[PDB]
């Protein structure tokens, strides 16, 4: 039946914090309407930097409905993340990610 936005979510809260100029990975668990894990044309993910620019997000399909989202935050500050399943934000989206120089 494909992924269900309300049942799909980001794995953990590690995504809330990241380091500038380091390739960063966020894991998303896709679940159908029944809550079952899948098993990706229905999934969209974008990241906006603190100056309003789009950041390229790479999505790699993994086993049993996990999708790895990778991005490279070039500047410090408050990034915006949104992940849409069939045009609907998943649970917990859109959200903030704080990138530090650390």
Numbering used by the authors: 691 to 729, 758 to 820
Task: Cite, word for word, the article reporting this structure.
LIN-41 belongs to the TRIM-NHL protein family. These proteins contain a TRIpartite Motif (TRIM) consisting of a RING finger domain (commonly endowing a protein with E3 ubiquitin ligase activity, for example), two B-Box motifs and a coiled-coil domain. Additionally, they also carry six so-called NHL repeats (named after NCL-1, HT2A and LIN-41) and may contain a filamin domain, which have been implicated in both protein-protein and protein-RNA interactions. To understand how this reprogramming is controlled, we searched for C. elegans mutants in which the activation of embryonic genome, a landmark event demarcating the switch from a germline- to embryo-specific transcription, is initiated precociously in germ cells. This screen identified a novel function for LIN-41, a member of the TRIM-NHL protein family, in preventing a premature onset of embryonic-like differentiation and teratoma formation in developing oocytes, thus ensuring a successful passage between generations.
One previously isolated lin-41 allele, ma104, is a transposon insertion into the sequence coding for the filamin domain. We found that the ma104 mutation resulted in an insertion of 16 amino acids into the filamin domain. To gain a mechanistic insight into the ma104 mutation, the filamin domain (residues 691–821) was subcloned, overexpressed in bacteria, and the protein purified to homogeneity. The protein was crystallized and the structure determined at high resolution (1.68 Å; for data collection and refinement statistics, see Table S1). The final crystallographic model encompasses residues 691–729 and 758–820, whereas a long insert (730–757) that is only found in Caenorhabditis LIN-41 protein sequences could not be built due to high flexibility. We found that the LIN-41 filamin structure exhibits a classical immunoglobulin (IG)-like domain fold consisting of seven β-strands arranged in two antiparallel β-sheets. Importantly, the 16-residue insertion present in the ma104 allele maps to the mid-section of the second β-strand and is very likely perturbing the filamin IG-like fold. Specifically, the 16-residue insert will prevent completion of one of the β-sheets resulting in solvent access to the hydrophobic protein core of the IG-like β-sandwich and thereby severely destabilizing the fold. This makes it very unlikely that the filamin domain of the ma104 allele is properly folded to exert its biological function.
